């Protein structure tokens, strides 16, 4: 929590300090680990000053090797008019992951939400996740 050069503090800090947390919008519960946890993240959708605007997508987590940021693979089908047939496609999206989702791992379906640009590529935030199977490689966030 406090191991870097600068003093890491919440964006909205107020003396009781209290664990700041705001309520996200259209029917997303606040994670339990975002309340009792001692972590500090400046880009979390709940305990920080980043909102969730219009677009909202979902995908499968494939990479869990970057700090507080994961890559979600979304697979769809593209329709070709001439041949009246579809074709498999995919796109990789870099999504910021808050430290609240402690059990998040590669290969788990994840719902992501848009926000203001957080990095050069990361502009989506993880909202909720669902557990799935195992493949002997328990790579977490």
């Amino acid at each position: 929590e406090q191991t870097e050069r600068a003093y890491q503090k919440q964006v909205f800090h107020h003396h009781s300090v209290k664990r700041y947390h705001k309520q996200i919008g259209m029917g997303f519960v606040t994670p339990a680990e975002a309340i009792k946890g001692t972590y500090i993240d400046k880009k979390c959708p709940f305990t920080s000053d980043v909102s969730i605007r219009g677009r909202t997508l979902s995908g499968i987590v494939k990479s869990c090797h970057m700090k507080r940021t994961i890559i979600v693979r979304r697979d769809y089908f593209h329709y070709v008019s001439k041949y009246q047939r579809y074709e498999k496609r995919h796109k990789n999206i870099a999504v910021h992951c808050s430290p609240a989702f402690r059990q998040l791992k590669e290969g788990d379906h994840v719902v992501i939400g848009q926000c203001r640009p957080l990095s050069k590529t990361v502009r989506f935030n993880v909202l909720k996740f669902t557990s799935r199977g195992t493949g002997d490689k328990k790579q977490f966030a």
């Binding site: 089908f77 070709v80 041949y83 047939r85 579809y86 074709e87 498999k88």
Partner: protein, 106 residues
């Protein structure tokens, strides 16, 4: 490959198989502006240097009057026919001559 989701191969197969088209490939390779003396140009302007008589092919028997022309753009040497009878007298050297193909396309 007939499947509903199998559109990747059918587009790949059609792309590869289109290159065997002798005429479609000709109009897409970079040789019209390189190997064809006319190129996309309808006609060509040049100068007359040498006059030829090309003997007709085996079924026929005669001498076809012809000229050798060097263009003003590429500078290559090409052979041109005389469209009418006795027109070799009218033709001269170092004069503007227009060359535009024949009945068959190039």
């Amino acid at each position: 490959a007939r499947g509903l989701h199998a559109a990747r191969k059918m587009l790949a197969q059609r792309r590869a198989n289109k290159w065997a088209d002798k005429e479609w490939k000709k109009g897409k390779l970079v040789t019209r502006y390189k190997c064809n003396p006319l190129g996309t140009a309808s006609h060509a302007k040049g100068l007359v240097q040498e006059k030829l008589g090309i003997e007709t092919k085996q079924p026929n028997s005669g001498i076809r009057k012809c000229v050798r022309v060097r263009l003003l753009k590429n500078g290559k040497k090409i052979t041109a026919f005389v469209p009418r009878d006795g027109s070799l007298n009218y033709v001269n050297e170092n004069d503007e001559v227009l060359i535009s193909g024949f009945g068959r396309r190039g």
